[PDB]
RNA sequence: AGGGCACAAGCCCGCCCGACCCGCGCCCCCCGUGCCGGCGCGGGCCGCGAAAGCGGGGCCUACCGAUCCUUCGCCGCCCCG
RNA sequence: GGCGCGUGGGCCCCUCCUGGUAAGCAGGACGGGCGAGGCGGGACGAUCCGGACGCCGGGCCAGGGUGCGCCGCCGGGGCCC
RNA sequence: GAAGGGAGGCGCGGCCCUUCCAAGGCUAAAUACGCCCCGGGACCGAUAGCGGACCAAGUAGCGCGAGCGAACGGUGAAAAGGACGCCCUGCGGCCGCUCAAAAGACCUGAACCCGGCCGGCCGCCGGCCCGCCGGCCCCGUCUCGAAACACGGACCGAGGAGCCACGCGCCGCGGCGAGCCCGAGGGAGCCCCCGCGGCGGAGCGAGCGCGAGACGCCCCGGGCCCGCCAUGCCCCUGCGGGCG
């Protein structure tokens, strides 16, 4: 019997097409 | 690290721990939480009571800093006084130079009554008290006050 | 070959025998107390080595107030704890006592140093009282974890535990006939 | 396409695999369904007994 | 550290508590007593067993 | 359909409405979950009887239904300057 | 006590049953086996008779057999297409 | 279809309070980002990496058209890229030359398949003075059950399939501990210094709200206490307080 708390995370949107909804932080020191 | 994972120890075995009769397929029971009242009714009834339906009244916009209400128990009061002043006040059980504590300055609104107090007079200022908190305070020689 | 060994016999059990921690201090202490027990057979040392092998989830912390309350009829004995000793600000005054622990908080250590008490390490306990003469072995409450209180099946009639997430409905949550 | 309806062929062997578990030793002394007047009297008699009362002082 | 531990363990204060353990069991291979008279004498000193 | 019942559980007569209100537990099916059905109790108010007593329907084993929505009833709480 | 996987098409033997003229047919029951059990025997067989397995040397022998293929036999009593 | 008007996360009517002035207009900074240029990398290394490392790639080629779209890297330090001689009707061959080496259109040069010479006679396991004796159905797969007249598999090489992000549960380990915490960011120091929320610390209740100590090495169980529901008695400031 699995006893877990249910997740409250939304499904991703626009992953292979559309606006770019991913922000990276590789430019933080710069 | 991938060196120490259980999946790397299944190379050479054909089905990777998922069985022969069943196998590893895509979504053999559905996606997400579907089926809660149908084929997953037993699971939902065993572990998640009160999951379906409505209950109580609704507020269209909660005012978050109006409902805020921190509390302090009467047994945590003396820890707000530093140690040197602590021993000084405890030594002289003075009635004319009693310590005065304003819990609102420390971030509390109401005083509750769990625990006990040292036997020594004290003045405590708050916005609200519990019934027992006042009773215990007056039995040790202190008095409660209301502060703006 | 050719023998029956599964008729009145049960499967073997697994128990810890080594500390499992990378900290070298704990390995040294465990080995020393194991040697002492090997050469004397005393029960205090046996329980001490077993305790030193326990995992962190099985070694709850102990407060100074609880220690004071537990030494009411035995103020001259030495309290021995295989865990860390923390402070209790709710207690304005503490008595004088001798305590041997794995670790002390800075505040607990300072409070004990004042009042004339003594904070002892397991190294000094081994040096002075290897067999635990005039010593009391104490532990915290093992069922105090928040994880421990959610074991079981919330939806069954005879359980007394709460569900894990947040639930907003009413079906099965308002008595025996809410279903 | 018909499949089997029922079998109890292997069930007794599975039951005995880890022995037949006995009930807990606290299930024998529960107050689960005892007569309330008896239970109330037992509570008051204990509390008034100086040798077994847990009231402070 | 490690060096400071055997110094403690080799002191007299810790040594006073040591108590010797009894002598261990004696174990030998099984041989036929009737093969030789010495082996038989090990089991029946009187030597009254015909073989 | 199978059990049960004789100064009765059958038939006749007299008075009645326990075919009530509040709150718990157990049995059957069973994962020892739900539903139908039953039983044992603590309080309130009642019926019959001289009284002890019995009575939460038709002697026992069948005769029935979640979430959301609507409608009705007692006592209260909210509409957030 | 905690966490978790696979499984949820089964079949055969012994004894006991139901439907069917019957079936290497269909459906049930206590125990065992194959599945997932090597090895010897039953000429030949997943299940029968013995025996349940690390790699070797020596001894004893279960079940089944002892004209020749092909390891291993004689003696006695009775019958005999 | 108008004169004072708008708003205060439940509608309608009335009375207040708190706040602002629509139906006209302009404005830097802190923010985002391909082509192109510069720098770097625990990245790929010619079936990989971009479709495209090759003096000619969106090329050759295919389709009425919209479109589709490859393959092909490497002599050597230096071209020193093969003297002379002898056979040959010519085609070519031999011998040798350059070079450390032919490395001779080229680094190394495996497997499958094949030609010559030289030795043998049918596969695997075991014993042996070596061809005799004994044993051995074709693997992978679904299946109660496969040597199957169940499916896939001519052969060889190279490639070829549980990784990563976020969320939830539990377990182990480290640091600190009634507390804990490299947030964004700022100091010209990838690793140094400073740095809020948050979570924990008190629960229950639809809600107005009210609000915990009494025992205990640990565990289990009893006993009490808080909130929700219902009741009895007493009383102040009263559908409020206290006690049960
Ligand atoms: K098949
Ligand atoms: K076919
Ligand atoms: Mg394979
Ligand atoms: Mg499956
Ligand atoms: Mg498969
Ligand atoms: Mg089935
Ligand atoms: Mg009668
Ligand atoms: Mg009654
Ligand atoms: Mg299946
Ligand atoms: Mg069949
Ligand atoms: Mg199978
Ligand atoms: Mg088996
Ligand atoms: Mg022979
Ligand atoms: Mg409003
Ligand atoms: Mg701008
Ligand atoms: Mg390429
Ligand atoms: Mg050979
Ligand atoms: Mg052969
Ligand atoms: Mg397959
Ligand atoms: Mg299939
Ligand atoms: Mg088939
Ligand atoms: Mg096969
Ligand atoms: Mg490969
Ligand atoms: Na029923
Ligand atoms: Na066999
Ligand atoms: Na290559
Ligand atoms: Na080279
Ligand atoms: Na076969
Ligand atoms: Na097929
Ligand atoms: Na084929
Ligand atoms: Na307890």
TrEMBL record, chain B:
* Residue ranges of domain Large ribosomal subunit protein uL15/eL18 in the record: 71-143
GO biological process terms, alphabetically, are:
translation
Which InterPro entries is this protein grouped with?
Ribosomal_uL15, Ribosomal_uL15/eL18, Ribosomal_uL15/eL18_sf, Ribosomal_uL15_CS
List the GO molecular function terms: structural constituent of ribosome
Q: Name one GO cellular component term.
A: cytosolic large ribosomal subunit
Q: Where is this region: Disordered?
A: 1-40
Which SUPFAM superfamilies does this entry report, sorted A to Z? Ribosomal proteins L15p and L18e
Q: Which UniProt keywords apply?
A: Ribonucleoprotein, Ribosomal protein
Q: Write out the biased-composition intervals (Basic residues).
A: 1-14
- Pfam families with a match to the protein in the record: Ribosomal_L27A
Does the keyword section mention Ribosomal protein?
Answer: yes
Write down the PANTHER family for this protein, in alphabetical order.
60S RIBOSOMAL PROTEIN L27A (PTHR11721), LARGE RIBOSOMAL SUBUNIT PROTEIN UL15 (PTHR11721:SF3)
Q: Family, per the entry?
A: Belongs to the universal ribosomal protein uL15 family.
What this protein is called in its record is Ribosomal protein L27a
Q: Lineage, please? A: Eukaryota, Metamonada, Diplomonadida, Hexamitidae, Giardiinae
From TrEMBL, chain C:
Q: Where is this region: Disordered?
A: 1-21, 153-179
Q: Which domain of life is it from?
A: Eukaryota
Q: Which Pfam families match?
A: Ribosomal_L18
Q: Name one GO biological process term.
A: translation
Q: State one molecular function term (GO).
A: RNA binding
Keywords from the UniProt entry: Ribonucleoprotein, Ribosomal protein
Q: Which residues form the signal peptide?
A: none
Q: Cellular component terms, GO, for this chain's entry?
A: cytosolic large ribosomal subunit
Q: Where is the composition biased (Basic residues)?
A: 159-179
Family membership, please give it: Belongs to the eukaryotic ribosomal protein eL18 family.
What is the protein's name according to its record?
Ribosomal protein L18
In its UniProt entry, the species of origin is given as: Giardia intestinalis (strain ATCC 50803 / WB clone C6)
Automatic annotation (TrEMBL), chain D:
Tell me where the signal peptide lies: none
Entry GO CC: cytosolic large ribosomal subunit
User: What's a single GO MF annotation on this record?
Assistant: structural constituent of ribosome
- Record bears the keyword Membrane: no
GO biological-process terms attached to the record: cytoplasmic translation
Record keywords, A-Z: Ribonucleoprotein, Ribosomal protein
Q: Where is the composition biased (Polar residues)?
A: 50-57
Please state which protein family the record places this protein in: Belongs to the eukaryotic ribosomal protein eL29 family.
Q: Does the keyword Acetylation apply?
A: no
Q: Which residues of the full protein are shown?
A: 15 to 71 of 75
Q: Where is the composition biased (Basic residues)?
A: 14-25
Report the protein name in the record: 60S ribosomal protein L29
Region feature Disordered, mapped onto this chain: 1-57
UniProtKB/TrEMBL annotation, chain E:
- Large ribosomal subunit protein uL4 C-terminal domain span: 1-46
The similarity comment for this entry is:
Belongs to the universal ribosomal protein uL4 family.
What name goes with this protein? Large ribosomal subunit protein uL4
In its UniProt entry, the species of origin is given as Giardia intestinalis (strain ATCC 50803 / WB clone C6)
């Amino acid at each position: 019997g699995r006893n877990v708390a249910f997740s409250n995370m939304r499904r991703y949107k626009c992953t292979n097409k559309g606006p770019n909804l991913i922000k990276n932080w590789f430019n933080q020191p710069a | 690290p991938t060196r120490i994972r259980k999946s790397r120890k299944r190379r050479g075995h054909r089905q990777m721990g998922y069985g022969r009769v069943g196998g590893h397929r895509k979504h053999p029971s559905g996606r997400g939480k579907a089926g809660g009242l149908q084929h997953k009714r037993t699971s939902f009834d065993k572990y998640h009571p009160g999951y379906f339906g409505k209950l109580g009244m609704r507020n269209y916009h909660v005012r978050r800093n109006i409902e805020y209400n921190p509390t302090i128990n009467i047994d945590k009061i003396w820890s707000l006084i530093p140690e040197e002043q602590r021993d000084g006040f405890l030594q002289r059980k003075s009635t004319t130079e009693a310590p005065v504590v304003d819990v609102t300055r420390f971030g509390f609104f109401k005083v509750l009554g769990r625990g006990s107090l040292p036997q020594c007079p004290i003045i405590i200022k708050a916005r609200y008290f519990s019934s027992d908190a006042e009773k215990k305070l007056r039995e040790v020689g202190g008095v409660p006050l209301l502060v703006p | 070959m050719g023998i029956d060994l599964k008729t009145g016999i049960k499967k073997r059990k697994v128990e810890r025998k080594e500390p499992k921690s990378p900290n070298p201090y704990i390995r040294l202490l465990h080995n020393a107390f194991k040697v002492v027990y090997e050469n004397t057979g005393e029960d205090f040392t046996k329980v001490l080595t077993k305790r030193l092998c326990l995992s962190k989830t099985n070694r709850p912390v102990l407060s100074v107030s609880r220690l004071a309350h537990l030494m009411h009829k035995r103020e001259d004995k030495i309290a021995v704890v295989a865990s860390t000793v923390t402070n209790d600000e709710r207690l304005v005054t503490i008595p004088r006592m001798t305590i041997c622990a794995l670790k002390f908080s800075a505040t607990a250590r300072s409070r004990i140093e004042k009042a004339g008490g003594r904070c002892m390490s397991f190294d000094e306990l081994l040096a002075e009282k290897p067999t635990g003469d005039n010593c009391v072995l104490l532990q915290g409450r093992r069922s105090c974890r928040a994880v421990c209180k959610k074991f079981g099946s919330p939806g069954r009639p005879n359980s007394h535990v709460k569900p894990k997430g947040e639930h907003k409905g009413r079906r099965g949550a308002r008595g025996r006939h809410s279903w | 396409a018909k499949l089997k309806n029922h079998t109890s062929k292997n069930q007794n062997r599975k039951d005995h695999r880890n022995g037949i578990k006995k009930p807990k030793k606290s299930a024998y002394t529960s107050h689960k369904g005892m007569c309330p007047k008896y239970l109330r009297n037992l509570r008051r008699s204990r509390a008034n007994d100086p040798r077994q009362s847990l009231r402070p002082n | 550290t490690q060096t400071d531990i055997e110094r403690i363990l080799q002191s007299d204060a810790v040594q006073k508590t040591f108590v010797p353990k009894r002598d261990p069991l004696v174990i030998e291979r099984k041989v036929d007593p009737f093969s030789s008279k010495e082996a038989l004498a090990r089991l029946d000193p009187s030597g009254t067993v015909m073989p």
